[PDB]
C-alpha cells in the first residue's frame with residue numbers, strides 16, 4: 001500500500017522528486033546514480049552555496065549499518081587528510097532524513113568509464129594515463145597509512161570521478177564495499193574484471209588486492225578495453241593466465257580454490273583444467289600495449305610521449321603491479337618512484 005507514509009517505494013528507496021527542498025537547506029535537482037545501497041542525487045546546498053552529491057541510503061537496517069561503516073571510514077580519513085591532498089572524495093557531513101541516512105559529498109565530474117565510453121572504448125593517451133596512475137598511487141599510499149590500512153576492495157573506472165571536466169584531477173568514490181586490514185571474513189570481493197588472483201584462489205589477502213585492480217585499470221584506460229574480461233571466475237583466471245602464465249607452484253599449493261582452475265599433475269606441476277585460450281604467457285602485454293607498433297591499434301603512432309622507451313616504462317610498472325605474489329607485488333611508495341613517473 002504505502003511504505004514510510006508514501007515517501008519510499010517497494011525497494012525501500014526514497015522517491016526522489018525534482019525541486020524538493022529538504023530542511024530548508026538542500027534543493028534536490030535530479031537523480032545522478034543508483035545502486036543496491038540506494039540512490040545518489042544532485043543537490044544545491046543553500047548554506048554553503050554549492051552543489052553537492054547526496055547518497056540516500058535505503059530505509060532498511062542492512063544498508064544503514066553498511067552505510068555506517070562507510071561513514072566511519074570516511075570520517076576517519078577526513079581526520080588524517082585535512083589538507084584534502086590524498087585524492088579521496090570528501091564527505092562533508094551526514095544526516096537522517098525521513099528514515100534515510102543521507103551522505104553529503106562534494107560534486108565531481110564524470111567517471112573514468114564515461115571517458116572510456118566517449119572514445120568508443122578506444123582509450124586515452126599515455127600522458128593522461130600517467131596522471132591518473134600517479135594520483136591513484138598517491139591515493140593507495142594514503143589508504144596504506146598504518147592507522148588507516150584501508151582496502152577500497154572495488155576499484156574500477158566507474159568508481160573514479162574527475163574533479164573538473166577540464167582538469168586531470170581524480171578522486172576515488174564509493175567505500176561501501178571497503179574494509180580495513182584484518183582477519184579474512186569475506187572471499188567474494190572485488191568486481192570480477194578487477195579481482196586479484198589471491199581472491200580468485202580463495203587465499204589470504206590484504207591491501208595489495210587494490211594494486212592488482214589498479215594494474216588492470218591503468219591498462220584499460222589506455223587501450224579502452226578490460227585487461228581481463230572474464231565472464232566467470234574460471235574465465236577470469238584463464239584470461240589472467242593467458243597474459244601472465246600459470247601462478248607459481250608455491251602459491252597454488254597454498255590456494256584452496258586452486259583446483260577450481262588448475263590440475264596438479266603427478267610430477268608436482270600445476271596445469272590448466274581443460275574446458276579457446278592462448279597458451280599461458282603468450283598474449284604478451286608487450287604486444288597488447290603495442291610497445292613497438294605505435295600503441296593500441298597503432299592509434300598512438302607519432303604522438304608525443306608514445307615512444308618505445310615510454311611504453312617500456314609503462315609495461316614494466318604494470319607488470320610489477322600484476323605480480324601474482326601480494327608480498328612482492330609493488331607498493332604505492334615504490335610505484336611512485338618508478339621511471340614511468342619521471
Ligand SMILES: COc1ccc2sc(-c3cncc(NC(C)=O)c3)nc2c1
Pocket residue numbers: 032033034035040053055089105106107108109110161173174175176
Ligand atoms: C556526479 O557527481 C558526483 C560527485 C560525488 C559523488 S560520490 C558518489 C558515490 C558514492 N557512493 C557510491 C557510488 N556508487 C554508485 C552510485 O554506483 C557513488 N557519486 C558521486 C557523484
